[PDB]
Design a binder for this molecule. Structure first.
Ligand SMILES: C/C(=N\O)c1ccc(O)cc1O
Length: 283
């Protein structure tokens, strides 16, 4: 086989898988998760992670640059959201709402901070516990981008020599963040129905053509169990035109998210997580 770097071994006792491994911080005897990336773009991912501070975004605890990259992260005992939706499995509407609300807060925080994830999927959504009512965290910032652009500098001069395709691109520039809202729409569709909106399964139309047209597969029997408000939100995120597509703010103001009970349950989970870290405060 091979061995772990001495620097890692100095601080952690390595254990079983879920490349992610379980490890114990020697100083605290606390469980951690160690992400092993095969061997530079990882340094930017580290840089992004170190700067972000949100309860629905994964936190980096340590980093080791050796024969491979070792990323020490907070352990999520609930695993991936993928495991909850795989093989036609579906979540109860109330659970979709609690998880989705947190995904929206996380993505709104990202967008506010000039970061686009670009790889939102159930595999990149982690659950804090094996309980249905838990905290979620967004992970896998490898494909992420940082939002002055080259276009702004180009527009500052006279366009005597400027190409038409550049001037045409001014219409859509600054809408890259909308790709995350589309991904959230697909995640929400999957969570509610237990099936993907766009697939090659039992269809003639190509996966590409389904997406560009925005003609998702609607199965009435599956969706009758789901509320009209939840489906209305999906429809608003699954809008082909990125400029018309719902933003995280528009999604957060949607009737489906105006649920005081769901919001209370989230604030409750937050308080419970923070209970171990809370310092006495000035009264
Ligand atoms: C930290 C992490 N991913 O980034 C992770 C990965 C898999 C798993 O089951 C639990 C986890 O905490």
């Amino acid at each position: 086989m091979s061995v772990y770097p001495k620097a890692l071994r100095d601080e952690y006792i390595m254990s079983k898988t879920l490349e992610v491994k379980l490890a114990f911080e020697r100083k605290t005897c606390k469980k951690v998760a160690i992400k092993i990336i095969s061997k530079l773009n990882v340094e930017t991912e580290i840089e992004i992670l170190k700067k972000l501070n949100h309860p629905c975004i994964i936190k980096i605890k340590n980093f080791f640059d050796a024969e491979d990259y070792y990323i020490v992260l907070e352990l999520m005992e609930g695993g991936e959201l993928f495991d909850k939706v795989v093989g036609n499995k579906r979540l109860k509407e109330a659970t979709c709402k609690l998880y989705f609300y947190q995904m929206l807060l996380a993505v709104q925080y990202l967008h506010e901070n000039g970061i686009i994830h670009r790889d939102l999927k159930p595999e990149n959504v982690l659950l804090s516990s094996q309980e249905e009512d838990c905290l979620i965290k967004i992970t896998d910032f490898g494909h992420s981008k940082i939002l002055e652009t080259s276009l702004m500098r180009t527009l500052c001069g006279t366009p005597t020599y400027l190409a038409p395709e550049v001037l045409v691109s001014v219409g859509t520039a600054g809408y890259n963040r909308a790709v995350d809202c589309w991904s959230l729409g697909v995640i929400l569709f999957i969570c509610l129905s237990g099936y993907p909106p766009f697939s090659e399964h039992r269809t003639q139309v190509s996966l590409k053509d389904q997406i560009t047209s925005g003609k998702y597969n609607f199965i009435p029997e599956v969706w009758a169990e789901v509320s009209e408000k939840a489906l209305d939100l999906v429809k608003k995120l699954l809008v082909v035109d990125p400029k018309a597509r719902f933003t995280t703010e528009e999604a957060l103001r949607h009737p489906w998210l105006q649920d005081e009970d769901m919001k209370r349950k989230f604030q409750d989970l937050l308080s419970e997580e923070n209970e171990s870290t809370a310092l006495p405060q000035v009264l």
